[PDB]
Amino acid sequence: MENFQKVEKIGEGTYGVVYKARNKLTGEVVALKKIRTEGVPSTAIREISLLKELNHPNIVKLLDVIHTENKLYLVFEFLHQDLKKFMDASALTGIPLPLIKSYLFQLLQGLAFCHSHRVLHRDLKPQNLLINTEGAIKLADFGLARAFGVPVRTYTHEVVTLWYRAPEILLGCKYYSTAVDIWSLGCIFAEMVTRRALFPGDSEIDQLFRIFRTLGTPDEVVWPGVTSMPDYKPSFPKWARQDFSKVVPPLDEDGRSLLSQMLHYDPNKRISAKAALAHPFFQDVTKPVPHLRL
Numbered sequence: 247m248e249n250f251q252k253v254e255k256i257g258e259g260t261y262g263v264v265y266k267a268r269n270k271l272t273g274e275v276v277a278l279k280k281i282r283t284e285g286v287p288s289t290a291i292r293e294i295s296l297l298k299e300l301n302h303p304n305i306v307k308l309l310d311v312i313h314t315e316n317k318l319y320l321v322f323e324f325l326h327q328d329l330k331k332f333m334d335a336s337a338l339t340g341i342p343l344p345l346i347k348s349y350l351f352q353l354l355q356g357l358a359f360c361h362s363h364r365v366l367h368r369d370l371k372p373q374n375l376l377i378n379t380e381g382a383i384k385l386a387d388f389g390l391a392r393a394f395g396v397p398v399r400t401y402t403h404e405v406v407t408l409w410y411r412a413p414e415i416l417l418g419c420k421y422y423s424t425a426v427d428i429w430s431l432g433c434i435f436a437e438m439v440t441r442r443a444l445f446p447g448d449s450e451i452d453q454l455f456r457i458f459r460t461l462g463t464p465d466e467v468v469w470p471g472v473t474s475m476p477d478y479k480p481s482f483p484k485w486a487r488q489d490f491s492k493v494v495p496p497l498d499e500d501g502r503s504l505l506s507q508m509l510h511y512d513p514n515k516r517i518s519a520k521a522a523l524a525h526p527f528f529q530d531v532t533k534p535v536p537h538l539r540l
């Protein structure tokens with residue numbers, strides 16, 4: 247590192263390996279992601295560079311985009327833990343409702359900000375949500391999907407998680423909208439509540455059918471235009487919708503109501519982040535401190 251000092255290898259992101267590193271000069275501790283290939287598309291560097299100006303308290307700060315030696319590195323502010331690890335650590339007792347609500351409220355503020363600036367995430371998941379000791383939670387990797395390209399694999403034959411993908415993406419829609427992020431966040435909200443992934447599909451069709459088995463196979467009534475989607479097949483089985491009370495028990499009606507609006511099939515009916523922030527569920531929102539063991 248011409249200016250760093252790898253503290254250790256965090257993990258293996260969807261784009262490349264991620265390291266915790268310390269800037270030798272400033273002494274700042276950061277997350278360094280080496281991006282995956284043979285020249286680095288100039289189209290990508292310009293788009294990524296624009297994300298440096300996208301700051302909000304609930305968005306992981308992109309500190310630098312380094313294009314040198316024909317390689318691409320992204321330098322991000324560092325946070326000590328992700329929501330996936332936190333949920334596993336809170337598996338026995340569950341994350342307290344006040345903290346679940348605080349986190350959801352903060353993530354929606356983060357999404358409202360990105361979306362108002364025409365920036366989508368497209369691949370939200372527990373591992374991309376970072377938390378600190380102060381009770382803050384932040385979204386990591388916003389806009390990388392568009393700037394770069396389709397995921398599929400990390401960089402070393404690793405299985406892409408489809409659990410949080412919106413149905414319109416699974417049905418082959420080529421144009422993503424802000425709604426895909428709201429869907430993923432609804433899936434995460436449900437998971438924090440029940441302590442089990444809502445739709446743990448192990449293939450694109452299994453993912454789609456797990457959604458259908460729970461929310462009902464969509465039709466033209468609830469989702470105008472669904473039967474004309476690229477990958478829609480008239481042969482899809484027709485499952486009846488399950489009662490929401492059985493999906494995320496023992497969540498209260500305010501919570502179930504908000505979740506139902508975040509999981510509407512029609513992306514156009516799906517609630518926006520701005521509107522979700524005003525939902526009665528957040529009437530008593532607070533900002534608790536989590537018990538974090540680092």
Ligand SMILES: NC(=O)c1cc([N+](=O)[O-])ccc1NCc1ccc(Cl)nc1
Pocket residue numbers: 256257259264266276277278279306322323324325326327328376386
């Ligand atoms: N910005 C970051 O700090 C960060 C970035 C990526 N990533 O993919 O670019 C992954 C995890 C991250 N932190 C959470 C974390 C998790 C585990 C450990 Cl040991 N230490 C920190």
